[PDB]
Design an enzyme around this catalytic site. Structure first.
Site, PDB file in Angstrom:
ATOM      1  N   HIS C  86      21.923 -28.763  12.705  1.00 62.06           N
ATOM      2  CA  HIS C  86      21.313 -29.966  12.832  1.00 62.06           C
ATOM      3  C   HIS C  86      21.760 -31.247  13.263  1.00 62.06           C
ATOM      4  O   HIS C  86      21.435 -31.879  14.014  1.00 62.06           O
ATOM      5  CB  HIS C  86      20.137 -30.263  11.621  1.00 62.06           C
ATOM      6  CG  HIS C  86      19.038 -29.095  11.427  1.00 62.06           C
ATOM      7  ND1 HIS C  86      18.198 -28.998  10.596  1.00 62.06           N
ATOM      8  CD2 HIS C  86      18.895 -27.881  12.106  1.00 62.06           C
ATOM      9  CE1 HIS C  86      17.556 -27.843  10.913  1.00 62.06           C
ATOM     10  NE2 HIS C  86      17.968 -27.309  11.668  1.00 62.06           N
ATOM     11  N   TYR C  90      21.588 -33.663  16.719  1.00 62.59           N
ATOM     12  CA  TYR C  90      21.102 -34.750  16.739  1.00 62.59           C
ATOM     13  C   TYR C  90      22.246 -35.495  17.773  1.00 62.59           C
ATOM     14  O   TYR C  90      21.838 -36.416  18.426  1.00 62.59           O
ATOM     15  CB  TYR C  90      20.919 -35.384  15.497  1.00 62.59           C
ATOM     16  CG  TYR C  90      19.595 -35.132  15.090  1.00 62.59           C
ATOM     17  CD1 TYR C  90      18.431 -35.244  15.779  1.00 62.59           C
ATOM     18  CD2 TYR C  90      19.431 -34.502  13.546  1.00 62.59           C
ATOM     19  CE1 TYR C  90      17.082 -34.913  15.078  1.00 62.59           C
ATOM     20  CE2 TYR C  90      18.087 -34.206  13.181  1.00 62.59           C
ATOM     21  CZ  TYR C  90      16.953 -34.346  13.870  1.00 62.59           C
ATOM     22  OH  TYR C  90      15.842 -33.993  13.456  1.00 62.59           O
TER      23      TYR C  90
HETATM   24 MN   LIG Z   1      18.094 -30.535   9.196  1.00 60.60          MN
HETATM   25 MN   LIG Z   2      15.868 -28.992   5.941  1.00 60.24          MN
END
Ligand SMILES: [Mn+2]
Ligand SMILES: [Mn+2]
Ligand SMILES: Cc1cn([C@H]2C[C@H](O)[C@@H](COP(=O)(O)OP(=O)(O)OP(=O)(O)O)O2)c(=O)[nH]c1=O
Ligand SMILES: Nc1nc2c(ncn2[C@H]2C[C@H](O)[C@@H](COP(=O)(O)OP(=O)(O)O)O2)c(=O)[nH]1
Ligand SMILES: Nc1nc2c(ncn2[C@H]2C[C@H](O)[C@@H](COP(=O)(O)OP(=O)(O)O)O2)c(=O)[nH]1
Ligand SMILES: [Mg+2]
Ligand SMILES: [Mg+2]
Ligand SMILES: [Mn+2]
Ligand SMILES: [Mn+2]
Lengths: 289, 683, 289, 683
Positions: C86, C90
């Protein structure tokens, strides 16, 4: 200078035990003596314990104390591999080869085995002794982690590799080789972090840290000898395994930037053989030709 | 491993830096002398063979009874006198695996190539011995190839229909939807591909007898048709294939397209149903100006105007629909819809694109009806009239449902024999016979339109093969010049044969007098523009063969005006999928996809070089993916101007090109007069 | 009853940033207005900042205090996804759409923003308050975690989903959809761990924990409304975003085994487009009466 | 929260250790006075209301024109002369939410209970003022309740059909399957549940005209029918409901059952298609002796014998089928199949169980056909003949498809009024009128069977309510004694009314002369056995009412022999789902599931105590799950011996009950003569 390349290497090595079908080992397992099967189960159970604690405790705690989001991402990934991939793979092997009662018995055996409890006590104790902002306690835990990654696993790894090299239990052996490939890079990475801390010290402090590392190695080594004899005497391999663990102890020291401690010996050559389309908007000029 | 497929795999073993293309001749020779001659049932004389085939329900007695056995023997001698040899292993393998007659247990081989050709010729001639010999010469020379249904089933007792393309108009009623499902299952049972127009069906959220938001839209009918085609799958050997067509101005167009999205739910997605979108020039104009387009609720338009939306001219009634308060409309972005079409074609190859005003500005039978949708192969473009299937006790108003018999000229063999006229006329006669002998007794509108329109489809193949074997690039202007002259000549001789058939039989197709053939407007560009080749290289290709001039076209126009035309439609260029191997020809008029085609049959891997491929013409066999789709559009539009129906036009896309490139290709095809776009194939 | 099932679903959802090519987003990004680009940047930074807290603290702290080897492994896997997958995703989206100087400024702004800080520090405060061997404090932190995973992210997710549903910024929207799909399962899983603690409590203690959860939800919700107006008024979307927040608040409550707090509302269609009793044999004499 | 909703919620508030049952009278009074009287459109006179209703497309002018306005005014006077009051809030709520006529925007109320009853009575009488007043008295006294279709739709311009249960035979052909799909969609469009017999369809892996292993079996047709019912969803109002029936000796029985498993694949599972299994006595005999059984491919049997497998008696034909080498079969374990049935019923409540030989051993029309399957509610058991739907050009061979008209006697109100004879005869007249006035234009077999058979279904309800309000336990022998006597009287007076109608019209039903009514075999048990109550308490319940004797039954037998019988079928006990609330009655002859019914409407929860529930009769309202299913089987078999069709028999099971217990209940039902088993409801 190195975290990014370790990040890339770790994520590209990602795997799950379910990728390897294990029913192919059923016959070569059936054919082993009771002594051989016993040693094999116990060996993998000892490995499971080490990975359980490396995943639950060791890697997460080191991640907590090491600064930098990328360094933390690598350590978090390694932690996941320990308990979500490695420790679990052993259960995949157990569930294929062994009946539930034998599985239950071997996990009971890890709880009561004095050498396995001692090594866990020592390693986890050092992990839990880390103090925030105290680089020396962190170094000590990283040495412990390198010794787990690059030395302690190897009394266990010997036997799956020994079989793999003879063309036996090759599916289980494939799993073990993947685990070993991971631990090798984990040991190097943690070793580099430990060296960072060591290199910040005075010469006097460095001398003490080498003493710590060598004393710890010897203490773990002496315990591992007894563990090795306990497991391997019934299959006739204790002396061979001992040579292997000394070989790997030297690799652990090297991962820490230290000189080899044990003299070189010939390792069993069998074990050596065991090793959508892009969316682009239409322009006004696209409608005229 | 079989010896013949081992020899066939030696093509790819590069010796002295070149492919061993001559291995395929050895491959087919070994294939024959090790499998085919061994597995072929041989009889003492042809009489015993024919008696065995008739008695054991392999052939039909009726068509063989129109000839004395001496005539049948003469026909079979004519077939075997050619001593035809398959040039490649794939040709013979495909024939003896797909079209050759086999025993009831699929164990031995009853028909050779000559036997099948002779039977098809005797079926075509219908009692004429000389005509049967002419058909034998035409097919054994491989100048003309009957379609897979006709070639496979001509003269066989336990056979499907000789027509496999059917187009159905569905009226906006539950009785008509039930009849459409029934007819679709009946025609899929016969082995044919069925296309359905869903534009007359009212959109989702329309009233069913004054209760609002009651209609499930065209997607519910789409699910019904998808399950109907899954049910009628003919053992599942060739599962039921259907196509649905929707006008782009239908309100359900977005839900119609969402049935092909990869992320579609199981309650929406259709799997066995191809989809096509009919795009009037109004939609392209609206997208070009970046204006706000409107999709319409068909039932509101029908209630307000008394006519279905797709039966009306959108380029003249779109503003009236928008301004009408009693018509229900939904605001859409036409450029967003175009981008969605491009994305859907990139990800799935769907929908088929029909440029409605491109079809209808040259359509010869707009008096009967405008073309509102295409077939499953996206090349049949004929006028249709919707049927009115009423309650059980009431009589049904039977309309006109499209179906045509397919047949392909082999451009290479026709040009080699300098026999465009004779091949076109004989193929027209054979297709007319197939139309006359077809009687669908469970599709009333298909039967009525077959009797009335008498439509046939005469296509061509081996265009790229002929050009590459003559040192002409597919994208080159010389290739388009050859295609222009060749297909103008094909159109000339097909019109001449249709007029001669009308003169002989004394009858024309229904409502011929309102057609552009009767008014003479069809022949305007033919009596005004000369289509002789503009290049000396192309002009030598037609040497020894008369090219009709403007005077010849004027004479033909007078002949048609004084005698009429027997076929409403004559020419349509189908994909010609599997018969291209048997004829050793490139598929249709489209460029080749692979120079050497690698396939796996069962547990065996075999390679098929393109017909005539060598080192002297390796680069003239340019793959379709490596060439400019604008030049392929130019070629297809050059051919399309001489074809009354459409051409199955596959778009060959690279992975690098975006949806904007696909949209640009579609808009250039619309600009250049392309009637339909079949597939967006990506490599 | 549930950890092995969630293990399976988690590991089979594994993905990497590199799988989605981002460059083709520049073909729609260039056509957005300044307010649209500004809102997108601010939303993205908000999500990034909150997700970092979850990777560095939220998931690892819960993994530390939860008992059970298999739960620790699943939690480790989730922490890995935050930090390794993640966070990189981003960063990749940002680097594609904005130059370095613009990224630094947006993060400076969002770092100082009152509404982003209020919620970020409220959540972090509850993670810092967990006490060893105190299941009440662990439960409170789990509630905070579920609120982040299943509720607080969604005022942010709205915008990428809104574009994604319109055919704009499709590559980054695909990435966001994968992230969101991970956070959904994270929220459900942590929710089940919280319910386990809740169900071990007395009736009075349960009522007290319910009051805690509702009170916390109220504080976060009132700040979300302000956060929402602050970001979305300039692009005219706040009314619809508020409906989406309440709908996701209800999902978060259901994850914690609680009743929905807000009345059911329909969601923006563009955003929507973006988004055995016991076998017993018959033993004869059952056919005779 | 509405005031009436609050008052209804105070029932559960226990005051002095008892439920406040009297709050429901306050709840209904508040509901009326605050909502109904406010939202009821009022007119100055009845003439203005009637004119508004006919002219605004609410009523039908045809049936109202049959009376002078004075007669209609007197009928409405008779309806309002009773001053009927709904006893509970749920009765009024259900009526004014499901059956009361509302404005086109569903905002106001046009019809009260009296207006609806008057309109239904005026439609029933068909021009007779005294008959209309009799119907008004019958319905306002709530002795007879017309079914939901009849009660809701009678006298309405925008109405569905008055029949909602249809039974279709499907022949083994694509034409017949397509026609079955069409007719199913047409009948579901009308709002009726459709039951399809799939036993004639050949199994999976059967030959289609010399192409072996080509049939998808009954599951492909099941998918087609499921999608057809999903599409024909009653204009998006109520989900389309259909049923499929298969014989247990059909080869596809295991595939048929696998469509209801929770783990079923999406290409096998059917969602909106209920399933029922037909079980002959041969299967139960094979399972009883644990002999391995055979399921047969129906097309092999049809080819060998010229008759369908379900058209033949399996008891005599099973050994011949097994010993015939030309009949294809596979071994099954009948006990394993029974256990699979019980497991499926535990998991999902499916399939319905129809005991074929229990139905046909007492069937009065076996000469016409045996009963092969039941309806969607498992109570319609009538002879059917399969239709031969041929090609479009050919003429179809129309058979008989079952469709009967439903009505329910209120046992409590009929018993308190001592009007078994009058209520039964008037209900028979009304059902006959509904049968005559029903004309379905898209189901030719349904229409033909409605015209020929003239079958009606007269059910009963409020059995448990009447028994519990009279201090009789449902499982008690006295309850079965009352059921025996009451339903013997109902059968007697229905037969008498049918013979009277036959005498008046001079016509019987088609093929009556072969029936057991004509030969007198039907009346054997009635002219030989006395069905008067055996208990003094039960005999006191029938005081003031003549119970037919053996001599009365002999007189009825002579009358039927002399004059014939107008209805092939008269009595069937349907579930009576929603009309039970309006009538303040327990559903059908089943025992109550719950003593107080907790339901949520909108965002407010409602409480419905069973009608007549109080402190004195609390334990006589024993819940069905607490009951012994063997005693419920005994009760239903006591009733079933006087019902010519079946009874909707729901099994009420506890969670602790095993598969063996469900199988034991099914086998005891088979032993006791139960014809059909509807549902397995588990608590
Ligand atoms: Mn996340
Ligand atoms: Mn999460
Ligand atoms: C009956 C039915 C129709 N439809 C749709 C499909 C048809 O295209 C359309 C027409 O149905 P029709 O069969 O024509 O219904 P109708 O004639 O009673 O209604 P109308 O007076 O408006 O013509 O309604 C459904 O979507 N679901 C259904 O159940
Ligand atoms: N003999 C024979 N001939 C066959 C068969 N299938 C096709 N033919 C063709 C070959 C010849 O062209 C033609 C006549 O063959 P024939 O009957 O043997 O005649 P002939 O060789 O005595 O003149 O039929 C076949 O099975 N047997
Ligand atoms: N006035 C009136 N009567 C209605 C209405 N709906 C049903 N009725 C019934 C009530 C009476 O039984 C019957 C006659 O009512 P009316 O026309 O007012 O009669 P009258 O009392 O003036 O002679 O119609 C209605 O809407 N208005
Ligand atoms: Mg209609
Ligand atoms: Mg048949
Ligand atoms: Mn490990
Ligand atoms: Mn490791």
């Amino acid at each position: 200078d190195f975290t990014q390349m370790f990040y890339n290497q770790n994520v590209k090595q990602f795997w799950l035990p379910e990728e390897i079908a294990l029913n192919g080992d059923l016959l070569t397992w059936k054919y082993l003596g009771k002594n051989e099967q016993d040693t094999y189960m116990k060996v993998l159970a000892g490995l499971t314990l080490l990975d359980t604690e490396q995943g639950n405790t060791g890697m997460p705690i080191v991640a907590e104390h090491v600064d930098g989001h990328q360094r933390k991402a690598v350590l978090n990934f390694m932690a996941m591999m320990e308990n979500a991939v490695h420790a679990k793979s052993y259960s995949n092997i157990f569930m294929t080869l062994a009946p539930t009662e034998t599985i239950n018995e071997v996990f009971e055996w890890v709880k009561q085995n004095k050498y396995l409890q001692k090594k866990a006590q020592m390693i986890v104790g050092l992990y839990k002794a880390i103090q925030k902002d105290d680089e020396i306690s962190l170094f000590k835990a990283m040495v412990a982690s390198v010794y787990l990654e690059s030395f302690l696993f190897y009394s266990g790894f010997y036997y799956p590799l020994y079989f793999y090299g003879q063309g036996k239990l090759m599916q289980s052996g494939e799993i073990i080789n993947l685990i070993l490939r991971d631990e090798a890079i984990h040991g190097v990475y943690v070793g580099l972090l430990a060296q960072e801390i060591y290199n910040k010290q005075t010469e006097e402090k460095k001398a003490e840290l080498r003493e710590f590392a060598i004393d710890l190695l010897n203490q773990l080594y002496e315990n591992e000898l007894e563990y090795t004899e306990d497991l391997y005497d019934q299959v006739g391999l204790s002396h061979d395994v001992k040579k292997f663990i000394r070989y790997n102890a030297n690799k652990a020291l090297m991962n820490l930037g230290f000189d080899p401690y044990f003299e070189e010996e010939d390792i069993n050559p069998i074990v050596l053989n065991g090793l959508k389309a892009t969316v682009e908007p239409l322009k006004d000029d696209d409608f005229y030709f | 491993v079989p010896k013949w497929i081992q020899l066939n795999n030696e093509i790819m073993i590069q010796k002295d830096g070149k492919f061993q293309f001559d291995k395929d001749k050895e491959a087919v020779h070994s294939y024959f002398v090790d499998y085919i001659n061994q597995n072929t049932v041989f009889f003492h004389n042809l009489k015993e063979k024919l008696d065995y085939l008739v008695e054991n329900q392999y052939y039909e007695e009726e068509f063989l009874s129109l000839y004395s056995f001496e005539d049948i023997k003469e026909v079979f001698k004519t077939a075997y006198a050619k001593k035809f040899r398959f040039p490649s292993f794939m040709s013979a393998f495909k024939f003896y695996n797909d079209y050759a007659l086999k025993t009831n247990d699929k164990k031995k081989i009853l028909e050779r190539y000559e036997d099948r050709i002779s039977i098809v010729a005797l079926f075509f001639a219908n009692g004429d011995t000389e005509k049967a010999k002419e058909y034998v010469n035409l097919m054994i020379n491989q100048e003309y190839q009957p379609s897979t249904p006709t070639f496979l089933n001509a003269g066989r007792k336990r056979r499907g229909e000789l027509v496999s393309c059917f187009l159905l108009e569905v009226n906006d009623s539950l009785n008509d939807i039930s009849r459409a499902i029934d007819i679709s299952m009946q025609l899929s049972k016969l082995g044919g591909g069925v296309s359905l127009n869903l534009s007359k069906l009212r959109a989702k959220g329309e009233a069913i007898k004054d209760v609002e938001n009651a209609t499930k839209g065209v997607v519910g009918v789409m699910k019904l048709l998808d399950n109907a085609f899954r049910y009628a799958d003919q053992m599942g050997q060739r599962q039921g294939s259907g196509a649905a067509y929707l006008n782009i101005f239908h309100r359900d167009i977005n839900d119609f397209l969402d049935t092909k999205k990869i992320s579609a739910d199981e309650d929406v997605r259709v799997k066995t149903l191809s989809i096509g979108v009919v795009i009037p020039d109004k939609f392209v104009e609206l997208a070009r100006e970046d204006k706000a387009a409107y999709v319409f609720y068909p039932h509101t338009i029908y209630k307000e105007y008394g006519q279905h939306m797709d039966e009306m001219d959108m380029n003249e009634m779109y503003d009236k629909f928008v301004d009408n308060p009693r018509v229900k409309k939904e605001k859409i972005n036409p450029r967003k819809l175009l981008e969605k079409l491009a994305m859907l074609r990139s990800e799935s190859g769907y929908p088929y694109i029909m440029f409605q005003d491109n079809v209808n500005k040259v359509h010869a039978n707009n008096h009967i009806s405008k073309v509102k949708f295409s077939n499953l192969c996206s090349e049949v473009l004929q006028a249709s009239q919707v049927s009115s299937y009423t309650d059980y006790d009431e009589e049904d108003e039977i309309g006109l449902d499209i179906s045509c018999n397919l047949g392909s000229l082999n451009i290479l063999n026709v040009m080699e024999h300098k026999s465009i006229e004779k091949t076109v006329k004989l193929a027209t006669d054979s297709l007319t016979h197939v139309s006359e002998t077809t009687d669908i007794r469970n599709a009333p509108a298909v039967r009525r339109a077959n009797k009335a329109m008498k439509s046939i489809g005469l296509g061509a193949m081996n265009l790229h093969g002929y050009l590459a074997q003559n040192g002409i690039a597919y994208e080159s202007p010389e290739a388009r010049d050859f295609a222009n002259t060749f297909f103008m000549m094909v159109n000339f001789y097909s019109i001449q044969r249709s007029a001669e058939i009308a003169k002989e039989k004394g009858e024309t197709f229904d409502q011929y007098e309102g057609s552009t053939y009767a008014t003479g407007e069809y022949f305007d560009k033919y009596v005004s523009t000369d289509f002789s080749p503009k290049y000396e290289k192309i002009a030598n290709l037609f040497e020894g063969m008369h090219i009709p001039t403007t005077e010849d076209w004027k004479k033909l126009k007078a002949f048609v005006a004084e005698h009429g035309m027997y076929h409403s439609y004559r020419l349509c260029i189908a994909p010609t999928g599997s018969i291209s191997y048997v004829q050793s020809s490139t598929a249709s008029v489209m460029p080749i996809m692979e120079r050497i085609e690698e396939r796996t049959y069962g547990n065996s891997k075999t390679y098929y070089p393109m017909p005539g491929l060598a080192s002297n013409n390796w680069f003239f066999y340019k793959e379709a993916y490596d060439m400019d789709m604008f030049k392929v559009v130019d070629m297809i539009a050059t051919i399309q101007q001489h074809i009354d129906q459409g051409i199955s036009f596959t778009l060959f896309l690279k992975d690098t090109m975006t949806t904007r490139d696909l949209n640009r290709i579609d808009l250039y095809a619309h600009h250049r007069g392309i009637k339909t776009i079949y597939y967006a194939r990506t490599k």
